[PDB]
Amino acid sequence: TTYADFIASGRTGRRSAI
Amino acid sequence: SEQESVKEFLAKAKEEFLKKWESPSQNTAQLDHFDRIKTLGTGSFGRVMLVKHKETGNHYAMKILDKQKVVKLKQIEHTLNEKRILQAVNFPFLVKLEFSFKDNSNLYMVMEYVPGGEMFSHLRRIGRFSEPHARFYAAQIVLTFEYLHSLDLIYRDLKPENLLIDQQGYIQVTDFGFAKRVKGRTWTLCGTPEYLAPEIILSKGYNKAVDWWALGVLIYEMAAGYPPFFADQPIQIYEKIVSGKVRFPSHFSSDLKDLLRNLLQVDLTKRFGNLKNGVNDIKNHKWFATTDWIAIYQRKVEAPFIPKFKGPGDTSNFDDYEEEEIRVSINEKCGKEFTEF
Numbered sequence: 001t002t003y004a005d006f007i008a009s010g011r012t013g014r015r016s017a018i
Numbered sequence: 019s020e021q022e023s024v025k026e027f028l029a030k031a032k033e034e035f036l037k038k039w040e041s042p043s044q045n046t047a048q049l050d051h052f053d054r055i056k057t058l059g060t061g062s063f064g065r066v067m068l069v070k071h072k073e074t075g076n077h078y079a080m081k082i083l084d085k086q087k088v089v090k091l092k093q094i095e096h097t098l099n100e101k102r103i104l105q106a107v108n109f110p111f112l113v114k115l116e117f118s119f120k121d122n123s124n125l126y127m128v129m130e131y132v133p134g135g136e137m138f139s140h141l142r143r144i145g146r147f148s149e150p151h152a153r154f155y156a157a158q159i160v161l162t163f164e165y166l167h168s169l170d171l172i173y174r175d176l177k178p179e180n181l182l183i184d185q186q187g188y189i190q191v192t193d194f195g196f197a198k199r200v201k202g203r204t205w206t207l208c209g210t211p212e213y214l215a216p217e218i219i220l221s222k223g224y225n226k227a228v229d230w231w232a233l234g235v236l237i238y239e240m241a242a243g244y245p246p247f248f249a250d251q252p253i254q255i256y257e258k259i260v261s262g263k264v265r266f267p268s269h270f271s272s273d274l275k276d277l278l279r280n281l282l283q284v285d286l287t288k289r290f291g292n293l294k295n296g297v298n299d300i301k302n303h304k305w306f307a308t309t310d311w312i313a314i315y316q317r318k319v320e321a322p323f324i325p326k327f328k329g330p331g332d333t334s335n336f337d338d339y340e341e342e343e344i345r346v347s348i349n350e351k352c353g354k355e356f357t358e359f
Contacts, residue, residue, distance in 0.1 A: 002244065002265075002267070003145075003243060003244060006243070006244035006245075006248055009248060009249070009250055010250045010251075011212070011248060011249070011250065012142070014059075014060075014136075014138060014179050015177060015179060015210050015211070015212060016061065016062045016210070017061065017062045017063075017175060017195070017196065017208065017209060017210050018062075018207065018208065018209060018210065018211060018214075018252070
């Protein structure tokens with residue numbers, strides 16, 4: 001599922017500005 | 019007429035803003051007025067600490083920037099923008115700057131402490147928001163951008179991490195580090211990867227339409243529980259953003275998909291918020307038909323939830339962070355660069 005793919009990704013925590 | 023009342027509201031709000039924009043406040047507190055308690059959160063440029071004012075006992079949230087780091091990272095003008103703008107604005111959904119000052123080493127912006135935590139935390143924990151709940155939050159951002167854009171301000175860092183939940187369950191937008199007052203277009207590569215509009219990625223000139231694109235990303239993320247363009251590394255995110263392709267969860271309503279495609283238009287000249295009717299294309303969209311815009315502004319709509327509150331100074335709605343010492347050199351650093359702060 002797309003949800004499962006997101007939850008297993010590296011970018012589920014707080015995201016910093018570039 | 020309702021439309022005239024809105025025009026009059028915005029004209030008076032601009033008069034009020036411009037007085038403060040042209041004559042900014044400066045040097046309205048000092049560090050030893052406060053005891054530092056704990057770090058509330060971090061960003062690429064600094065940290066925000068819970069502090070307690072010694073004389074009144076009130077708690078505040080203090081953003082601290084190291085002047086030498088700001089210079090090294092080429093953020094001088096952005097930091098001057100942040101403080102000049104935040105001391106001049108006044109809106110129900112913008113965090114209040116209470117004091118600002120500097121010393122030999124650092125710059126300080128003392129805000130009202132917003133105790134309910136980042137929207138981010140609540141959104142990740144619950145998974146996704148229902149459409150009515152997402153709509154409640156989205157309406158506040160629509161009004162906030164109507165206000166900011168009318169003052170020639172572009173915000174440029176919308177994301178759940180920057181949307182704090184107050185004790186009434188309403189939003190307070192924080193972090194004006196990339197906010198800028200501009201008439202016509204600008205070019206800086208700034209923002210957060212998931213939220214960048216195509217014209218930023220493609221190194222084109224851009225305008226306030228980037229904030230409307232970012233609203234599309236935010237509404238999608240609130241209602242889906244994940245962003246419309248995600249990957250493990252920024253470059254793969256950028257490829258998806260510029261592609262013109264977006265997929266929606268099967269549970270999204272017809273009206274939500276329609277609104278989102280209109281905000282996530284890759285051609286800024288076709289994007290909602292940037293057409294002839296401006297913000298009214300968004301406010302009049304079917305997905306917002308049940309929204310009472312004045313009731314939202316006045317904070318009279320029942321909130322989706324009230325954050326838990328265990329007394330003043332409680333930080334249980336925020337993660338814990340490693341603490342670092344706030345040192346102040348005996349010698350003034352970067353005085354000329356930060357004169358106006």
